[PDB]
Amino acid sequence: QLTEEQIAEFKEAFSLFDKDGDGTITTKELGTVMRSLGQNPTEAELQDMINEVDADGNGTIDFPEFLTMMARKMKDTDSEEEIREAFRVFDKDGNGYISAAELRHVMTNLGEKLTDEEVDEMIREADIDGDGQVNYEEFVQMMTAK
């Protein structure tokens, strides 16, 4: 169940999307973040993602709506599909392998900070077969673990 800290980690995630801090995530804002992640959703697809979370249907997502959905998916730890979605965000060229360059790019955009040293250690810890890339099987073990 929810805690003061977890709420701050969610407000974190919400701020990535709500660029102008007006307290709401718009269709336009979601598009900007998605494109920074290597995706190119049409306005129709953007509207549908907003609608999934827009509980009062005013066309945008506010923090209470964002929290509701996030806390609910979290209560769910059978989210195998959520993990594939995260994998897809990383694997920009869709070859089934997350390269050090792909990992660094997403981290730099997801509001993170990683030195090439940390980027390599991140991969090295999950790279079970040692090819320098993180395949899907490896990603799951890396994500489902701690």
């Binding site: 980690e9 969610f10 974190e12 995630a13 990535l16 999307f17 973040v33 998605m34 992640l37 995706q39 993602m49 979370v53 964002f66 959905m69 996030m70 998916k73 979290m74 989210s79 959520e82 993990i83 979605e85 995260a86 897809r88 965000v89 990383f90 997403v106 981290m107 997801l110 509001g111 993170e112 990683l114 940390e118 250690e121 991140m122 890396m142 994500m143 701690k146």
Partner: peptide, 21 residues
Amino acid sequence: KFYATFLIQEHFRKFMKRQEE
């Protein structure tokens, strides 16, 4: 990709701790 982006953010958090030590 809201929750998927959170998962990624959460994994990095976990990393920066398995680093802190």
